[PDB]
Design a protein around this ligand. Structure first.
Ligand SMILES: OC[C@H]1O[C@@H](O[C@H]2[C@H](O)[C@@H](O)[C@@H](O)O[C@@H]2CO)[C@H](O)[C@@H](O)[C@H]1O
Ligand SMILES: OC[C@H]1O[C@@H](O[C@H]2[C@H](O)[C@@H](O)[C@@H](O)O[C@@H]2CO)[C@H](O)[C@@H](O)[C@H]1O
Ligand SMILES: OC[C@H]1O[C@@H](O[C@H]2[C@H](O)[C@@H](O)[C@@H](O)O[C@@H]2CO)[C@H](O)[C@@H](O)[C@H]1O
Ligand SMILES: OC[C@H]1O[C@@H](O[C@H]2[C@H](O)[C@@H](O)[C@@H](O)O[C@@H]2CO)[C@H](O)[C@@H](O)[C@H]1O
Ligand SMILES: OC[C@H]1O[C@@H](O[C@H]2[C@H](O)[C@@H](O)[C@@H](O)O[C@@H]2CO)[C@H](O)[C@@H](O)[C@H]1O
Ligand SMILES: OC[C@H]1O[C@@H](O[C@H]2[C@H](O)[C@@H](O)[C@@H](O)O[C@@H]2CO)[C@H](O)[C@@H](O)[C@H]1O
Ligand SMILES: OC[C@H]1O[C@@H](O[C@H]2[C@H](O)[C@@H](O)[C@@H](O)O[C@@H]2CO)[C@H](O)[C@@H](O)[C@H]1O
Ligand SMILES: OC[C@H]1O[C@@H](O[C@H]2[C@H](O)[C@@H](O)[C@@H](O)O[C@@H]2CO)[C@H](O)[C@@H](O)[C@H]1O
Ligand SMILES: OC[C@H]1O[C@@H](O[C@H]2[C@H](O)[C@@H](O)[C@@H](O)O[C@@H]2CO)[C@H](O)[C@@H](O)[C@H]1O
Ligand SMILES: OC[C@H]1O[C@@H](O[C@H]2[C@H](O)[C@@H](O)[C@@H](O)O[C@@H]2CO)[C@H](O)[C@@H](O)[C@H]1O
Ligand SMILES: OC[C@H]1O[C@@H](O[C@H]2[C@H](O)[C@@H](O)[C@@H](O)O[C@@H]2CO)[C@H](O)[C@@H](O)[C@H]1O
Ligand SMILES: OC[C@H]1O[C@@H](O)[C@H](O)[C@@H](O)[C@H]1O
Ligand SMILES: OC[C@H]1O[C@@H](O)[C@H](O)[C@@H](O)[C@H]1O
Ligand SMILES: OC[C@H]1O[C@@H](O)[C@H](O)[C@@H](O)[C@H]1O
Ligand SMILES: OC[C@H]1O[C@@H](O)[C@H](O)[C@@H](O)[C@H]1O
Ligand SMILES: OC[C@H]1O[C@@H](O)[C@H](O)[C@@H](O)[C@H]1O
Ligand SMILES: OC[C@H]1O[C@@H](O)[C@H](O)[C@@H](O)[C@H]1O
Ligand SMILES: OC[C@H]1O[C@@H](O)[C@H](O)[C@@H](O)[C@H]1O
Ligand SMILES: OC[C@H]1O[C@@H](O)[C@H](O)[C@@H](O)[C@H]1O
Ligand SMILES: OC[C@H]1O[C@@H](O)[C@H](O)[C@@H](O)[C@H]1O
Ligand SMILES: OC[C@H]1O[C@@H](O)[C@H](O)[C@@H](O)[C@H]1O
Ligand SMILES: OC[C@H]1O[C@@H](O)[C@H](O)[C@@H](O)[C@H]1O
Ligand SMILES: OC[C@H]1O[C@@H](O)[C@H](O)[C@@H](O)[C@H]1O
Ligand SMILES: [Ca+2]
Lengths: 150, 150, 150, 150, 151, 150, 152, 150
């Protein structure tokens, strides 16, 4: 079971549930926050080769694009929800350092800042740049990349 | 251990030990050949996050740059060899579809052809282009990609 | 490649995959049985001087200490498994008549009897005595020793 | 066929024809000397399982107990001779690290010393101890054991 | 030479603004809370006496006053921008307890005391200390980075 | 270049280098003493918002917990030292009237007296009370507070 | 006296590394320049982090050497600045055998323009070239010709 | 102080006192050997900037050029000796990966092989090449370099 932190490469902030709860409600926004604590730990459950569910370790809820478009448009907010469904499939690209949804868009901080402030929402967007890059690091060492597929 | 074929993307040929031996001798060349059978199956030994050994399934021998240098120059031949050491580390980049050595060069067919004939050698070359793309697929379905870090 | 029978010297029984299948599943126990047939033929693939894989001829699976640990404790069961790795390395000592694992223990009949009944399991044990002795003989002449290193 | 050096384990010296000739005369003694060169390389030609001829690589002559008797007494000198016959059968025990003649005695340094001087003769003798141990090593790396049975 | 900063209401993350967001608010314009960030809500601090100084709206140069300009304003006195400089407009920026204190000892509060005041909530003086009157002083380019307002 | 006296609020004594030396050695203790002179003048060098170095004006040495540990335990002596690093970072809380270390403990007179006698040592301690209050005053008026940040 | 203080001497010219302006507490992103002068405001220390890699520390300020901007692989011609921040993009090694200062990503500290005789106030910049003009030696505050060990 | 292994970079063997004694006699040769244990751990006592004593940890004896010339010639044997003298000053060049004596020659394997056998003597020699490269590693991890100047 590899528990990891999802670190925004450009700012050093991390993916958090909005509120930091061990049990965020369904459709709780996924934000960037500088803090580190067990309630921002994630896991990845491989489903089909590169594709799987990004799972909030404390609640078991997984990352979803808000709604059910399957092919979400740019600026679609990312949330947590207990449901498992194909539209919640992502890949964790540790070679290009990004997170790609099954329909081909990536997780971004909303607005594209290299230094997004705490509580900035995350959204889907097709663009590629240094501000949408994320790396996956050890909870006991924020500079140690860990393999999220194992 | 999950077993996969290393398929040259442009041609559909596969990486082989030279000669097709179940127990190829040390320093046997790795070549592209169209045949599929048990003796060209591969596995991947994770060592450190993305880095590991590419292992020949039938013998347990792993892929080495000829000469075993830490930082091999272009055109260093790829072979099999029993030694397991940090100079034979590669990553399987299934997002950009290539195989990269620890010192930063990639596995290429010697000469760079997108449709190399059977028995073409492989070498280390630092450039990135199409003729060096490889995908990792199921032995029982050569068109279905499989996750090698698991 | 020489094919041979692994004969328990004291009893004349032979090592078998428990059940006699031609393709035993991973982790099938190795047992002693008196019968001779093609599904108890073995081969030896040299890896590094004295060390190699003991291979079930009919299935291509090799002998492993159950659990695949590098340094298995006494009574660890011997099984057949498809993986090839350092922890499945043995030497076939045809001078002292035993089978030694890379970490220094030997193949024994479970319980150490000089006359074990059919289906007796085999286990690893560090002790040396007459009940852990094995000789390597021709499938067509169970009393003629054959060279397993060739 | 594998070419090797016969190294006295206790002293690190090697087995030589007396005088170091590329074509020793019949009945030339075999001695211990520390030097390494092509005229002290050996090969093993397997005849029957463990039994074979110890062949001087440069000349093709093989190791004999002087006189060619089937059951040589203690202190019988070892020599080279071109004749090939059963009384010249030895086995290369790479598990107990010794060389045994078919009638059951071993090759020794004359006198049984752990550190014999250069040009010390070799003789047959039934005793087993540290000073009659030999290992069989690569001509390019005198500490690397090689399998003489291939 | 004088640092520029945002005055962020700690509990809500809203900011002190001139009501209307103008870069030249008239004298006696109310100071309100609002989520927006732009250069017309930047402030500066002009030190006058150790901890005491003028809180200055960067775009207009007008400073924060208790409405009416009394030396000892009562609770609920509205805070405004005014161009005059005088010793009844002296405040200290307490970056250790996270509040803004007037020379006579009352603090800047959102009117109504909410940890979540809506946009346009007025600000007033009140003597009470609690989490709804806490403010932090942050960089215009990084709303989570506290900056030193005295230097 | 604001120079100031560090005055113990309850007693009116001041922070001195032990000995009143213009050039105190590394690890010289910081005591309380009634005297006023150029050798007990201090400065504060800002490094990060509230955080900076408390600097002995005459020597340029700064205030350290003895040993310079990140999380010094209660009763850790305060000393002078020339080296600048993160464990010698303090904030001058002129609103609550105390001196706080980066790890959260405060500078106290050893023993907690509201009237410590001359030569009382100072130490780190986590308690807040009247005897650990300090004010920062003009060298030309011990009752005139001065801004230490500007 | 506790951590080795030293001067960073440009070998070809004999000038030293200074903070532009010569301050004891230079602001963040202050450029590092070259200057003939000696004073305790150009003293440096080296804080070891991982074997050869560590932080080059302006002794008086306590701020550390960074490629301007904090990029891991600064392009050639990136000026060197002093910043209070500490992170992985400010790791350097002090090669006192080949006489250079190397960044974790492999480029060296140079005088801007590569002169063996750079003028006062010459900026320093990162760059991949190796030559007699990018060589530095690390010397004692009490003897500009005495090399001192910067790693203890 | 700090303890390390002196690893011949090209072969992975280490420096040892010949014989492996925890108290080698004065003038014992320094040799190469594959083993790792407590009586081949080294320390480095700094004397003058880069110059210091290479110290055998178990005995405290330091490395000397054999004999007494100030400026020893190529092929001068390296030995251990308890004496401290300026003729035993070396620098541990961890940037170019070599060990240089005060008079300007380097420590080499006798004969200059990239794969010297166990017991190979070490000598001074002025040449620089791959076979005289050494790295200084942790006793617990032969591949992890450690800082020897501390
Ligand atoms: O929000 C992540 C993406 O933002 C893009 O920019 C937004 C921007 O807020 C809007 O003003 C306009 O530029 O279109 C975009 C909305 O889809 C970034 O430019 C893009 O790179 C992403 O990071
Ligand atoms: O061999 C891998 C590379 O082949 C390159 O071509 C070689 C080749 O040996 C020969 O055709 C001649 O041109 O020298 C070249 C040196 O690399 C390809 O151009 C290159 O992309 C690699 O795949
Ligand atoms: O255990 C190895 C031996 O199995 C023998 O057959 C077993 C059989 O597998 C089991 O199902 C039951 O019938 O007991 C039998 C005992 O004969 C094979 O016949 C024997 O050849 C071994 O392979
Ligand atoms: O010494 C080994 C040889 O013994 C031979 O006996 C004779 C041999 O016939 C003769 O050629 C000469 O070598 O003297 C030997 C001692 O009498 C065996 O006949 C020969 O086969 C070798 O074994
Ligand atoms: O030749 C090797 C053997 O040496 C034997 O020693 C002789 C010994 O030389 C002689 O003086 C007398 O003791 O008879 C012994 C038997 O031949 C050793 O006894 C034996 O160990 C061998 O190594
Ligand atoms: O009118 C007073 C407010 O005006 C704001 O203008 C705003 C609007 O009211 C606000 O909701 C924002 O999101 O968009 C408008 C810009 O056209 C000022 O920014 C603000 O200070 C208020 O005081
Ligand atoms: O106005 C700032 C003060 O509000 C006080 O409470 C208000 C209350 O919230 C409001 O709705 C009305 O009842 O008047 C009260 C008394 O002024 C807070 O209690 C006080 O602490 C201030 O924040
Ligand atoms: O030194 C400042 C603090 O001293 C405390 O007294 C110590 C002391 O070591 C001993 O009296 C015992 O009570 O442990 C105390 C630490 O908790 C004062 O009690 C405390 O108020 C501080 O001033
Ligand atoms: O730039 C670093 C050097 O500046 C010197 O000061 C300069 C500077 O131009 C200005 O501050 C003025 O004082 O003129 C000086 C010309 O020499 C520092 O004094 C010098 O030590 C350097 O650090
Ligand atoms: O130069 C080292 C520092 O760079 C910081 O970023 C700079 C950068 O120039 C720009 O992005 C803006 O934010 O100003 C910063 C100066 O503080 C790094 O983020 C910081 O780590 C320092 O290393
Ligand atoms: O900065 C030191 C380097 O100077 C370089 O000279 C120019 C160079 O020609 C230009 O391409 C760019 O790098 O600007 C440099 C001066 O700022 C030298 O080419 C290089 O060797 C270094 O000395
Ligand atoms: O919005 C997310 C935030 O929520 C808070 O409750 C938590 O304490 C923060 O550390 C962060 O999780
Ligand atoms: O919001 C995320 C998604 O979660 C589930 O409910 C479902 O797949 C969609 O209905 C959508 O709500
Ligand atoms: O070079 C690789 C090849 O080896 C040959 O012996 C065989 O004909 C092919 O199937 C292929 O495996
Ligand atoms: O060519 C492959 C092999 O080459 C040897 O020279 C090297 O030492 C081995 O470890 C292996 O890499
Ligand atoms: O039973 C032995 C086997 O056990 C597995 O857990 C391991 O993955 C295999 O590779 C092999 O070691
Ligand atoms: O399970 C096998 C073991 O059986 C024991 O009874 C015996 O004492 C051991 O030597 C070992 O052979
Ligand atoms: O007696 C055997 C010896 O003969 C010598 O002439 C030769 O130089 C030595 O290497 C060794 O062969
Ligand atoms: O509202 C604040 C203002 O109040 C006025 O009445 C006063 O005269 C001004 O000087 C200023 O203090
Ligand atoms: O311990 C410090 C003391 O040492 C004296 O030399 C100094 O003059 C005194 O005023 C007192 O401060
Ligand atoms: O010569 C040095 C070597 O000596 C061997 O005899 C010893 O067993 C080894 O530990 C090694 O140190
Ligand atoms: O290493 C050999 C040399 O070592 C010194 O300790 C000794 O004083 C020299 O005269 C010589 O014996
Ligand atoms: O003994 C050390 C020497 O070994 C020789 O073979 C080589 O020519 C020299 O370069 C030096 O390494
Ligand atoms: Ca001094």
């Amino acid at each position: 079971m590899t528990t990891f932190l999802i670190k925004h490469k450009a700012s050093g902030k991390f993916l958090h549930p909005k509120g930091g709860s061990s049990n965020p409600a369904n459709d709780t926004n996924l934000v960037l926050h500088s803090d580190i604590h067990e309630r921002m730990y994630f896991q990845f459950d491989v489903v089909d080769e590169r594709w799987g569910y990004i799972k909030h370790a404390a609640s078991g809820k997984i990352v979803h694009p808000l709604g059910g478009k399957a092919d979400p448009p740019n600026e679609t907010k990312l949330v947590l929800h207990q449901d498992r469904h194909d539209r919640a499939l992502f890949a964790m690209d540790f070679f290009n350092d990004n997170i790609i949804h099954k329909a081909g868009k990536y997780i971004h901080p909303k607005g594209g800042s290299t230094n997004p402030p705490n509580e900035t929402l995350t959204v889907m967007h097709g663009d590629k740049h240094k501000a949408m890059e994320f790396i996956f690091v050890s909870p006991k060492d924020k500079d140690k990349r860990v393999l999220v597929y194992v």
